[PDB]
Amino acid sequence: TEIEILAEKIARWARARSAEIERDRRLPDELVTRLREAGLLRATMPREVAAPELAPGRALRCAEAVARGDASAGWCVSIAITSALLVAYLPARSREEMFGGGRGVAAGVWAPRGTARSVDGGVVVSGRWPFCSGINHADIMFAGCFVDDRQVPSVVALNKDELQVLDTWHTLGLRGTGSHDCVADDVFVPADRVFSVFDGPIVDRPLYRFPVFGFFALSIGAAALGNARAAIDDLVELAGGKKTLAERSATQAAAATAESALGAARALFYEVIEAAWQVSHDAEAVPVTMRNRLRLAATHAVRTSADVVRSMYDLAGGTAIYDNAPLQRRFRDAFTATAHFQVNEASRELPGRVLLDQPADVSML
């Protein structure tokens, strides 16, 4: 069957529904079903819950291919396969309750915005989390919080049932991601469903040795990269018959600059994923040096993708300002992705610390 091939087929479906995806701020049910049937929304869950436990380079290649069809759809894949890693941090019994037998699609917001009081058998958590991508089609939301007075934050596995989904996702781009805010109000969480990411996974296999904050950052890079490739596709198709635009010296120098910039960002992206994947098979934890390279490459990929899409948009000139032009949505989507905290310009400083052998807190690298 081959999941990469299914990803490319689903990308073409996402492209054909892209007007409706943006209009409704959500993926159509038929597209969620395709994604679910191909295993893409649970690809990185462990084999014990009937899931592919797909290697991370393959999973990220799948996210990128769907993003080339539609950036919001690919982003949904990115967040679902990142969230799905946390299924490996649940004790066997709550894992089987929420995800057993092919069940459960996860969303996740890592920021520790909740406050959790400890009680008999569990905790009581309240808080509000912005930018919950995929909450429209997920069952479970992993959310970060502080438990009692601890200074190391925790994660609680909430059911969408007990949450209030507010209609707040009115944004420049990535509209289909429906990344609304979610509110918990005195929700009880059994102990079964509270953990620290910093204690490591219950399932101790290579996919879960792969750095989990690195993977999060890389999945945004994958969606950005797939969006940018689609923008170059759009410009090349326009330039042949616009009068021509293609026959003109600045256009080809710019097309050449963009193609080599994107190719170079893409090549570094997969080179560092493959190198970290190899050492994820070794006894010791993946070193800080390797984790540093994953974050460098993720940020570079998102920022280069934005530069590339901006250049294509600019070359299209008067065509791309109109709502019916494909480059306009790529532009809007690319400059929503650059705002994410895992891959913004500020995320260059800590990985620069490491490079310069300076004292650094690398707990979330």
Residue numbers in the entry: 6 to 248, 255 to 376
Sentences from the paper on this structure:
Our subsequent investigation of one gene cluster (Rv3093c-Rv3095) associated with ethionamide resistance that contained a putative monooxygenase/repressor pair with some resemblance to ethA/ethR, indicates that Rv3094c is likely a flavin-dependent monooxygenase that sulfoxygenates ethionamide, and Rv3095 is its transcriptional regulator. To investigate the mechanism of ethionamide sulfoxygenation by Rv3094c, we solved protein crystal structures of apo-Rv3094c, and Rv3094c in complex with FMN (Rv3094c-FMN) and ethionamide (Rv3094c-FMN-ETH), at resolutions of 1.91 Å, 2.00 Å, and 1.64 Å, respectively.
The overall structure of the apo-Rv3094c monomer consists of an N-terminal domain (residues 7–95) composed of five α-helices, a middle domain (residues 96–214) composed of four α-helices and an eight-stranded β-barrel fold, and a C-terminal domain (residues 216–376), with a seven-helix bundle structure. A structure-based comparison between Rv3094c, one-component monooxygenases, two-component monooxygenases, and Baeyer-Villiger monooxygenases showed that Rv3094c clusters with two-component monooxygenases. Superposition of apo-Rv3094c structural homologs not only reveals strong structural conservation of overall topology, but confirms that the location of the FMN binding site, lying in the pocket between the β-sheet and the C-terminal domain, and stabilization of the flavin ring by hydrogen bonds are also conserved.
